[PDB]
From a paper:
Professional antigen-presenting cells express a subset of different alleles of heterodimeric MHCII proteins on their surface. These MHCII proteins are capable of binding and presenting both foreign and self-antigens to potentially activate CD4+ T cells via cognate T cell receptors as part of the adaptive immune response. The structural hallmarks of antigen binding by MHCII molecules are well understood at the phenomenological level: Optimal occupation of the four main pockets (P1, P4, P6, P9) in the MHCII-binding groove by peptide side-chains and concomitant formation of a conserved set of hydrogen bonds mainly between peptide backbone and MHCII side-chains are necessary and sufficient to guarantee high-affinity binding of certain epitopes and their subsequent surveillance by T cells. Initially, the class II-associated invariant chain peptide (CLIP) occupies the MHCII-binding groove, but can later be replaced in the endosomal compartments for higher affinity antigens.
We introduced an alanine in position β82 deleting the two H-bonds between βN82 and the peptide's P2 site, which have been shown to contribute remarkably to pMHCII stability. Indeed, DR1-βN82A/CW is a kinetically destabilized complex that displays a clear reduction in thermal stability of 19 °C, concomitant with a dramatic acceleration of the non-catalysed (DM-independent) peptide-exchange rate. Strikingly, Surface plasmon resonance (SPR) measurements report that the binding of the mutant to DM is massively increased, showing a KD value in the 100 nM range for DR1-βN82A loaded with CW as well as another high-affinity peptide (HA), while binding of DR1/CW to DM was hardly detectable. In order to elucidate the basis of this phenotype, we solved the crystal structure of DR1-βN82A/CW. The limited resolution of 3.2 Å was conceivably due to the reduced thermodynamic stability of this complex. Surprisingly, the DR1-βN82A/CW structure was nearly indistinguishable from the high resolution DR1/CW structure, with an root-mean-square deviation (RMSD) value of only 0.432 Å. Moreover, nuclear Overhauser enhancement spectroscopy (NOESY) spectra of DR1-βN82A/CW in solution did not indicate structural alterations if compared with the much more stable DR1/CW complex, and chemical shift differences between 1H-15N-TROSY-HSQC spectra of both DR1-βN82A/CW and DR1/CW were restricted to the site of mutation. Thus, even in the context of an optimal P1 anchor residue, a mutation in the β1 domain α-helix leads to a kinetically instable complex (DR1-βN82A/CW) that tightly binds DM. This biochemical phenotype is not explained by the ground-state structure as detectable by crystallography and NMR. Taken together, the βN82A mutation destabilizes the β1 domain α-helix fold, which contributes to an overall increase of the mobility in the entire region surrounding the peptide N terminus.
Residue numbers in the entry:
A (entry chain A): 2 to 180
B (entry chain B): -30 to -12, 2 to 104, 113 to 188
Write the structure that this text describes.
């Protein structure tokens, strides 16, 4: 009987020249490597007390990944990836109660390639305050997952929108949430 | 302390010896460490994926590279010929998977966070179970020691992405005075079932 699965997931994408490196434990991100600053970023900072990782190793791996991608691209006679549009769900971390701090979750699922532009709107207004996001999480069907977060103060007057853009989408997806 | 990383293999740059709507080309690489009954049996899968479609894989059960699609033929044959990088991957179940388990086990396998339970009316009675880990959980409704398997609807398990889970289980009933409702939750993070009554 299987109990746990640890997955090291890397990828490279042309012509975007984007790539990531992360470890997955039962669907949760353990950590990822910040390629630009070359530092290990643990999902929970508490994780860094118990373990360490040489961030440099990720960059070398990704370089081997690009190398093999160039060969695979030419071998496949430049066959491009088939776009798969994302499934979008908006949820809260906890049940919403008035004037008590909560967090909006924008869940992006079942999509490829791993490129998405996500914007948070409140009452028509673009917001950047306190926003955060995970890396592109792996799936067994080799599609991708991604989480977007927006801390917020529950109100009867305010209305929110999560807008997601993807090449696999006919038109951008706006998902609604209200009290 | 140091967490260990597996390194992918370079494809042959010489197949025959010496001699924005733009299309996207994607290459994915996965080292999957599957653990059965703790660390008794450990399986390693190296998966090579081009445009969401796996082309070649190494299975510790197989002990060598196997092509998954026609695109994967050259990689399997080339890598299998290197008969001491194949030896290196066979013992990766120990050097990589099992190693990462021992390091990881403290804050992953043994990670336990007690669920927060709240019960409130909405014609409906909602039992909210949030902030718990791991995901395996069972939530049941009690009507003063009697339970109904009718009119019960659950959202199922929701992964918040921050190593916490939540779920909502609602009971269809218009709460009259006098009756007593009880939501009971069982989870590995607790040593005795959580009760919240209404």
């Amino acid at each position: 009987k299987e109990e746990h699965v640890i997955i090291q997931a890397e990828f490279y994408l042309n012509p975007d020249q984007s790539g990531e490196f992360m470890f997955d434990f039962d669907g949760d991100e353990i950590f990822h490597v910040d390629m630009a600053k070359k530092e290990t970023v643990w999902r929970l900072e508490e994780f860094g007390r118990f373990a360490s990782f040489e961030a440099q190793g990720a960059l070398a791996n990704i370089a081997v990944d690009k190398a093999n991608l160039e060969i695979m691209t030419k071998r496949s006679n430049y066959t491009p990836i088939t776009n798969v549009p994302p499934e979008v769900t908006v949820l809260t971390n906890s049940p919403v109660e008035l004037r008590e701090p909560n967090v909006l979750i924008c869940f992006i699922d079942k999509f490829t390639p791993p490129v998405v532009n996500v914007t948070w709107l409140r009452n028509g207004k673009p917001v950047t305050t306190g926003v955060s996001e995970t890396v592109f999480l792996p799936r067994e069907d080799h599609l991708f997952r991604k989480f977007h977060y927006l801390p917020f103060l529950p109100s009867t007057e305010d209305v929110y929108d999560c807008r997601v853009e993807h090449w696999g989408l006919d038109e951008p997806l706006l998902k609604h949430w209200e009290f | 302390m140091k967490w260990r990383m597996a390194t992918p293999l370079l494809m042959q740059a010489l197949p025959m010896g010496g001699g924005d709507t733009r299309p996207r080309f994607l290459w994915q690489l996965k080292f999957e460490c599957h653990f059965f009954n703790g660390t008794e049996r450990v399986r390693l899968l190296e998966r090579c994926i081009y445009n969401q479609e796996e082309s070649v894989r190494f299975d510790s059960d197989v002990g060598e590279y196997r092509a998954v699609t026609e695109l994967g033929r050259p990689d399997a044959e080339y890598w299998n010929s290197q008969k001491d990088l194949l030896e290196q991957r066979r013992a990766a179940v120990d050097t990589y998977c099992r190693h990462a388990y021992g390091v990881g086990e403290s804050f992953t396998v043994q990670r336990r966070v007690e669920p927060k339970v709240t019960v409130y009316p909405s014609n409906l009675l909602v039992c909210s179970v949030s902030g718990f880990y791991p995901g395996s959980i069972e939530v049941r409704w009690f009507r003063n020691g009697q339970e109904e398997k009718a009119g019960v609807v659950s959202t199922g398990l929701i992964q918040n992405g921050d190593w916490t889970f939540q779920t909502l289980v609602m009971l269809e009933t218009v709460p009259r005075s006098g009756e007593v409702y009880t939501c009971q939750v069982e989870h590995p993070s607790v040593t005795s079932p959580l009760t919240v009554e209404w």
